[PDB]
Short mmCIF file of all heavy atoms in Angstrom, two decimals:
data_model
loop_
_atom_site.label_atom_id
_atom_site.label_comp_id
_atom_site.label_asym_id
_atom_site.label_seq_id
_atom_site.Cartn_x
_atom_site.Cartn_y
_atom_site.Cartn_z
N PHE O 6 0.98 14.29 2.12
CA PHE O 6 1.21 15.53 1.41
C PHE O 6 1.19 16.71 2.36
O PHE O 6 0.62 16.60 3.46
CB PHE O 6 0.21 15.68 0.26
CG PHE O 6 0.55 14.83 -0.94
CD1 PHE O 6 -0.10 13.63 -1.16
CD2 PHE O 6 1.53 15.24 -1.84
CE1 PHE O 6 0.21 12.85 -2.26
CE2 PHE O 6 1.84 14.47 -2.94
CZ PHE O 6 1.18 13.28 -3.15
N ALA O 7 1.89 17.76 1.93
CA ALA O 7 1.98 19.03 2.59
C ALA O 7 2.26 18.90 4.06
O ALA O 7 3.17 18.24 4.48
CB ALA O 7 0.74 19.82 2.36
N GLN O 8 1.47 19.56 4.88
CA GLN O 8 1.80 19.50 6.27
C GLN O 8 1.87 18.05 6.85
O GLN O 8 2.64 17.78 7.77
CB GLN O 8 0.84 20.37 7.06
CG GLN O 8 1.31 20.61 8.50
CD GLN O 8 0.18 20.97 9.46
OE1 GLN O 8 -1.01 20.71 9.17
NE2 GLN O 8 0.53 21.59 10.59
N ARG O 10 3.05 15.36 5.50
CA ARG O 10 4.40 14.93 5.15
C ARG O 10 5.44 15.61 6.00
O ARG O 10 6.33 14.97 6.55
CB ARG O 10 4.71 15.25 3.68
CG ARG O 10 6.18 14.91 3.29
CD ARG O 10 6.61 15.32 1.86
NE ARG O 10 6.47 16.77 1.81
CZ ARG O 10 5.51 17.44 1.15
NH1 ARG O 10 4.64 16.81 0.35
NH2 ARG O 10 5.46 18.77 1.25
N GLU O 11 5.33 16.91 6.09
CA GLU O 11 6.28 17.67 6.84
C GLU O 11 6.30 17.22 8.31
O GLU O 11 7.36 17.09 8.89
CB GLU O 11 5.96 19.15 6.72
CG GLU O 11 5.99 19.70 5.30
CD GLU O 11 7.29 19.40 4.58
OE1 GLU O 11 8.38 19.74 5.10
OE2 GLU O 11 7.23 18.80 3.48
N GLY O 48 -10.40 14.91 11.79
CA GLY O 48 -11.00 16.22 11.67
C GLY O 48 -10.08 17.13 10.88
O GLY O 48 -10.55 17.88 10.04
N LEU O 50 -7.86 16.27 8.66
CA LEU O 50 -7.29 15.39 7.67
C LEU O 50 -8.23 14.99 6.54
O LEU O 50 -9.43 14.89 6.67
CB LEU O 50 -6.81 14.13 8.39
CG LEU O 50 -6.20 13.01 7.59
CD1 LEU O 50 -4.87 13.46 6.99
CD2 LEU O 50 -5.97 11.83 8.50
N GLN O 56 -6.60 8.11 -5.89
CA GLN O 56 -6.78 9.38 -6.62
C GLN O 56 -8.22 9.98 -6.50
O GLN O 56 -8.57 10.97 -7.13
CB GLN O 56 -6.28 9.21 -8.07
CG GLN O 56 -4.72 9.31 -8.16
CD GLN O 56 -4.12 9.11 -9.58
OE1 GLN O 56 -4.44 9.84 -10.52
NE2 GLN O 56 -3.21 8.13 -9.70
N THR O 57 -9.01 9.40 -5.62
CA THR O 57 -10.38 9.82 -5.40
C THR O 57 -10.56 10.01 -3.92
O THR O 57 -10.15 9.15 -3.15
CB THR O 57 -11.34 8.74 -5.93
OG1 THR O 57 -11.42 8.83 -7.36
CG2 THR O 57 -12.76 9.02 -5.47
N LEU O 58 -11.16 11.13 -3.51
CA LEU O 58 -11.32 11.45 -2.09
C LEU O 58 -12.42 10.69 -1.41
O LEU O 58 -13.54 10.68 -1.88
CB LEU O 58 -11.69 12.89 -1.92
CG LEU O 58 -10.59 13.92 -2.07
CD1 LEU O 58 -11.22 15.27 -2.29
CD2 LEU O 58 -9.73 13.93 -0.83
N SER O 60 -14.38 9.06 2.46
CA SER O 60 -14.61 9.27 3.88
C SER O 60 -13.76 8.28 4.66
O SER O 60 -13.19 7.36 4.09
CB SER O 60 -16.09 9.18 4.26
OG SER O 60 -16.47 7.85 4.61
N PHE O 74 -3.70 14.02 3.64
CA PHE O 74 -3.24 15.38 3.50
C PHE O 74 -4.25 16.28 4.13
O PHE O 74 -5.37 15.87 4.41
CB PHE O 74 -2.97 15.71 2.05
CG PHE O 74 -4.20 15.75 1.22
CD1 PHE O 74 -4.82 16.96 0.96
CD2 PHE O 74 -4.75 14.59 0.72
CE1 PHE O 74 -5.97 17.01 0.20
CE2 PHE O 74 -5.91 14.62 -0.04
CZ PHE O 74 -6.52 15.82 -0.31
N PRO O 75 -3.84 17.50 4.42
CA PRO O 75 -4.72 18.40 5.13
C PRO O 75 -5.75 19.04 4.21
O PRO O 75 -5.52 19.34 3.05
CB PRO O 75 -3.77 19.46 5.66
CG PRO O 75 -2.37 18.91 5.38
CD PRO O 75 -2.52 18.11 4.18
N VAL O 77 -7.96 22.47 3.82
CA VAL O 77 -7.53 23.83 3.99
C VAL O 77 -8.72 24.70 3.85
O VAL O 77 -9.48 24.56 2.88
CB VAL O 77 -6.50 24.19 2.94
CG1 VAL O 77 -6.29 25.73 2.89
CG2 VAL O 77 -5.24 23.47 3.26
N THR O 78 -8.94 25.53 4.85
CA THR O 78 -10.06 26.42 4.79
C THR O 78 -9.59 27.82 4.91
O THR O 78 -10.40 28.69 4.86
CB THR O 78 -11.06 26.17 5.91
OG1 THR O 78 -10.36 26.17 7.14
CG2 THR O 78 -11.70 24.80 5.79
N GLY O 79 -8.29 28.07 5.03
CA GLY O 79 -7.87 29.44 5.12
C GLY O 79 -7.87 30.09 3.75
O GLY O 79 -8.01 29.44 2.76
N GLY O 80 -7.63 31.39 3.70
CA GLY O 80 -7.52 32.05 2.44
C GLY O 80 -7.42 33.50 2.67
O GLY O 80 -7.37 34.32 1.75
N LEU P 41 -6.43 35.65 -0.79
CA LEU P 41 -7.00 35.09 -2.03
C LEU P 41 -7.72 36.15 -2.86
O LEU P 41 -7.58 36.22 -4.09
CB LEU P 41 -7.93 33.91 -1.74
CG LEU P 41 -7.16 32.68 -1.28
CD1 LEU P 41 -8.12 31.55 -0.91
CD2 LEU P 41 -6.16 32.20 -2.32
N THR P 128 -12.62 33.19 1.27
CA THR P 128 -12.75 33.37 2.68
C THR P 128 -11.75 32.52 3.46
O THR P 128 -10.87 31.90 2.87
CB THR P 128 -14.18 33.00 3.08
OG1 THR P 128 -14.39 31.62 2.78
CG2 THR P 128 -15.14 33.69 2.19
N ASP P 129 -11.90 32.48 4.78
CA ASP P 129 -10.93 31.78 5.59
C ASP P 129 -11.55 30.97 6.67
O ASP P 129 -10.99 30.76 7.67
CB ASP P 129 -9.98 32.81 6.22
CG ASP P 129 -10.73 33.90 7.00
OD1 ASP P 129 -11.96 33.76 7.19
OD2 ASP P 129 -10.16 34.94 7.41
N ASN P 130 -12.76 30.52 6.46
CA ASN P 130 -13.45 29.73 7.48
C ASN P 130 -14.57 28.92 6.83
O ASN P 130 -15.24 29.35 5.90
CB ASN P 130 -13.96 30.61 8.65
CG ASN P 130 -15.04 31.58 8.24
OD1 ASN P 130 -16.23 31.25 8.25
ND2 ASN P 130 -14.65 32.82 7.92
N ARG P 134 -17.81 29.45 4.00
CA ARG P 134 -17.68 28.64 2.79
C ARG P 134 -18.94 27.81 2.59
O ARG P 134 -19.42 27.66 1.46
CB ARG P 134 -16.46 27.73 2.80
CG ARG P 134 -15.16 28.47 2.75
CD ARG P 134 -13.91 27.59 2.98
NE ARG P 134 -12.66 28.36 2.95
CZ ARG P 134 -12.08 28.67 1.82
NH1 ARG P 134 -12.64 28.26 0.73
NH2 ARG P 134 -10.97 29.37 1.74
N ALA P 152 -8.61 27.88 -1.35
CA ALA P 152 -8.18 27.91 -0.01
C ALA P 152 -6.68 27.86 0.03
O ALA P 152 -6.02 27.24 -0.82
CB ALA P 152 -8.82 26.67 0.75
N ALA P 153 -6.12 28.46 1.07
CA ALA P 153 -4.67 28.47 1.24
C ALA P 153 -4.37 28.69 2.66
O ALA P 153 -5.00 29.50 3.33
CB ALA P 153 -4.06 29.63 0.43
N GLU P 157 0.14 25.15 1.49
CA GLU P 157 -0.80 24.27 0.84
C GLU P 157 -1.94 25.08 0.31
O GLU P 157 -2.55 25.83 1.02
CB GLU P 157 -1.37 23.22 1.80
CG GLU P 157 -2.16 22.17 1.05
CD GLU P 157 -2.92 21.23 1.95
OE1 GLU P 157 -2.64 21.23 3.14
OE2 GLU P 157 -3.85 20.53 1.46
N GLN P 159 -5.55 24.94 -2.45
CA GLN P 159 -6.49 24.09 -3.10
C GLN P 159 -7.49 24.90 -3.82
O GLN P 159 -7.91 25.97 -3.36
CB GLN P 159 -7.30 23.32 -2.07
CG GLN P 159 -6.66 22.06 -1.60
CD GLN P 159 -7.42 21.43 -0.43
OE1 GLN P 159 -8.64 21.61 -0.31
NE2 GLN P 159 -6.71 20.70 0.42
N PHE P 179 -14.38 16.64 7.05
CA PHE P 179 -13.49 17.14 8.07
C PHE P 179 -14.22 18.04 9.05
O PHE P 179 -15.36 18.48 8.80
CB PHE P 179 -12.30 17.85 7.45
CG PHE P 179 -12.64 18.96 6.52
CD1 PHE P 179 -12.87 20.25 7.01
CD2 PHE P 179 -12.61 18.78 5.15
CE1 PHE P 179 -13.13 21.31 6.13
CE2 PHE P 179 -12.86 19.82 4.28
CZ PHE P 179 -13.13 21.10 4.78
N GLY P 180 -13.57 18.29 10.17
CA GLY P 180 -14.12 19.10 11.23
C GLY P 180 -14.78 20.40 10.78
O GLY P 180 -14.94 21.31 11.59
N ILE P 215 -10.37 18.26 -6.44
CA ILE P 215 -9.66 19.25 -5.64
C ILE P 215 -8.31 19.28 -6.32
O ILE P 215 -7.69 18.21 -6.50
CB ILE P 215 -9.38 18.78 -4.18
CG1 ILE P 215 -10.61 18.77 -3.32
CG2 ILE P 215 -8.42 19.67 -3.50
CD1 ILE P 215 -10.28 18.40 -1.88
N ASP P 219 1.07 21.69 -3.40
CA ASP P 219 1.99 21.52 -2.29
C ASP P 219 3.19 22.36 -2.59
O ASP P 219 4.06 21.93 -3.32
CB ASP P 219 2.34 20.05 -2.17
CG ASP P 219 3.01 19.69 -0.88
OD1 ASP P 219 3.62 20.55 -0.24
OD2 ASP P 219 2.94 18.55 -0.43
N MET P 221 5.60 23.32 -0.83
CA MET P 221 6.82 22.91 -0.24
C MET P 221 7.57 22.09 -1.21
O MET P 221 8.77 22.21 -1.29
CB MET P 221 6.58 22.10 1.01
CG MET P 221 6.49 22.94 2.23
SD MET P 221 7.97 23.86 2.72
CE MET P 221 8.56 22.71 3.82
N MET P 228 -7.22 15.27 -6.81
CA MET P 228 -7.99 14.20 -6.24
C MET P 228 -9.42 14.40 -6.71
O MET P 228 -9.96 15.48 -6.63
CB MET P 228 -7.98 14.36 -4.74
CG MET P 228 -6.64 14.89 -4.19
SD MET P 228 -5.66 13.45 -4.03
CE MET P 228 -4.32 14.20 -3.13
N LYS P 229 -10.05 13.35 -7.17
CA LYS P 229 -11.41 13.43 -7.64
C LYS P 229 -12.36 13.56 -6.48
O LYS P 229 -12.20 12.94 -5.44
CB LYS P 229 -11.74 12.18 -8.43
CG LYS P 229 -13.21 11.91 -8.62
CD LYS P 229 -13.40 10.81 -9.66
CE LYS P 229 -14.78 10.81 -10.19
NZ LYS P 229 -14.86 9.78 -11.25
#
Side-chain angles (χ1 to χ4, degrees):
Chain O
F6 283 100
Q8 193 203 20
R10 175 185 61 253
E11 300 307 305
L50 178 67
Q56 280 178 59
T57 283
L58 284 163
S60 89
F74 68 96
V77 166
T78 52
Chain P
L41 289 176
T128 62
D129 54 9
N130 66 87
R134 292 171 182 278
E157 190 189 347
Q159 274 172 28
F179 56 85
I215 287 184
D219 194 336
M221 271 296 265
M228 324 276 189
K229 162 168 198 176

